[PDB]
Amino acid sequence: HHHGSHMESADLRALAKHLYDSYIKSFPLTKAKARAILTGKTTDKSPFVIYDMNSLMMGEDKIKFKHITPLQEQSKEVAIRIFQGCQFRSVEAVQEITEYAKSIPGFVNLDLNDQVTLLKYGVHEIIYTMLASLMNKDGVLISEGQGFMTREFLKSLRKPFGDFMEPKFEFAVKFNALELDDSDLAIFIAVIILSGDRPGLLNVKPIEDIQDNLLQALELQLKLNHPESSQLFAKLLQKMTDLRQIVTEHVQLLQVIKKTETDMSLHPLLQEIYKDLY
């Protein structure tokens, strides 16, 4: 309706500053930095770009690990290698999202199982959201922004994998047009985590009490940060529901990979070895 300046908004603004500070510490590559890389507006070096098989073969030579596994199915060798690469990064994203989730005021004091339930269902939606920060119309920044894989190259992968990243790109172009910065995304991520309608929650009301404060802080943030924007808060609420129906089709997609590959779930001990050596 109208804005007041009455210590209540001062608390909502302080919560946004607190969420932004934790957001910066939890995630190294911010959207503000990712946008600087995508437009060259950075004194740092340009990332390596993978746009075909030659540039991918040239990019594989820059990695210390080898992983030959010589076989006849080289089209699946490349597709599996790329899929296992982003799979590994997803694990690193979870512990970063969990780190940020701990910093949301009140999250740690919740039931320990509900913290797992909120993260179990919310991690996929946050990765879906933060993936848009690394994308433009051409491709996506990968590996701490040191690599850039084009959208059409990912599109050309073998039958099941050529459609894995496409729904994410189609979401990113619609989501990036909202022009949210890191300050907006910090509260938007916190609202996604504290969703009281996750299946199997125990104490729903304490979760909604936290989210209502985050929803108020977000609305105050969007109206201040985006003066030339109309109904941006309602647009973000719809984008959350868009994630739910599109992330279930995402988990149904990779469950096919979990079965039609007959050996895709990376062994937990071997995956831990790659983590501890790097």
Q: Does 266 sit near ligand EKS (CB under 6 A)?
A: yes
Footprint (CB under 6 A) of ligand EKS, residues 140-169: 140, 142-143, 146-147, 149
250 among the known binding-site residues?
Answer: yes
Q: Please check whether residue 207 is in contact with residue 128, taking contact to mean a CB–CB distance below 8 angstroms.
A: no
- The single residue among 37, 101, 118, 134 that binds ligand EKS, judged by CB under 6 A, is 134
- How many angstroms separate the CA atoms of 69 and 92, rounded? 25
> Shortest distance, CB of residue 179 to ligand EKS, whole angstroms?
18
Query: 135 pairs with which residues across the strands?
Result: 140
Strand pairing report for 139-142 and 147-150: antiparallel
Footprint (CB under 6 A) of ligand EKS, residues 28-57: 29, 48
**Stretch near ligand EKS under the rule CB under 6 A, chosen from 1-9, 62-70, 113-121, 228-236:** 62-70
274 among the known binding-site residues?
Answer: yes
Q: Please check whether residue 196 is in contact with residue 208, taking contact to mean a CB–CB distance below 8 angstroms.
A: yes
x/- mask, ligand EKS, residues 87-116, rule CB under 6 A, reads: -xxx--x-----------------------
**Stretch near ligand EKS under the rule CB under 6 A, chosen from 3-11, 36-44, 84-92, 250-258:** 84-92
Which one, 11 or 52, has the nearer CB to ligand EKS? 52
**11 Cβ neighbours under 8 A, 6+ residues apart:** none
> Shortest distance, CB of residue 93 to ligand EKS, whole angstroms?
4
CB-count exposure of residue 141 (10 Å: 0-12, 13-18, 19+): buried
Report the half-sphere exposure of 137 (CA within 13 A, side-chain side): 2
Indicate the SS3 state at residue 228. coil
What SS3 string covers 81-119? HHHHHHHHHHHHHHHHHHHHHHHCCCCCCCCHHHHHHHH
Q: Which residue is nearest to ligand EKS (CB)?
A: 85
Q: Does 131 sit near ligand EKS (CB under 6 A)?
A: yes
**Stretch near ligand EKS under the rule CB under 6 A, chosen from 108-116, 124-132, 190-198, 234-242:** 124-132
Which one, 89 or 235, has the nearer CB to ligand EKS? 89
Question: CA-based diameter of the chain, in Å?
Answer: 69
Q: Does 62 sit near ligand EKS (CB under 6 A)?
A: yes
Starting at the edge strand that comes first in sequence, how are the strands of the sheet with 139-142 ordered?
48-50, 147-150, 139-142
Strands (E), the chain: 48-50, 139-142, 147-150
Q: Does 79 sit near ligand EKS (CB under 6 A)?
A: no
Q: Does 71 sit near ligand EKS (CB under 6 A)?
A: no
**253 Cβ neighbours under 8 A, 6+ residues apart:** 163, 164
Place of tokens 């979760």: 207
**Where do contacts with ligand EKS occur on this chain (CB under 6 A)?**
29, 48, 59-60, 62-63, 65-67, 69, 80-82, 84-86, 88-90, 93, 127, 130-131, 134, 140, 142-143, 146-147, 149, 266, 274
Q: Which residues are known binding-site members for rosiglitazone? A: 87-90, 124, 250, 274
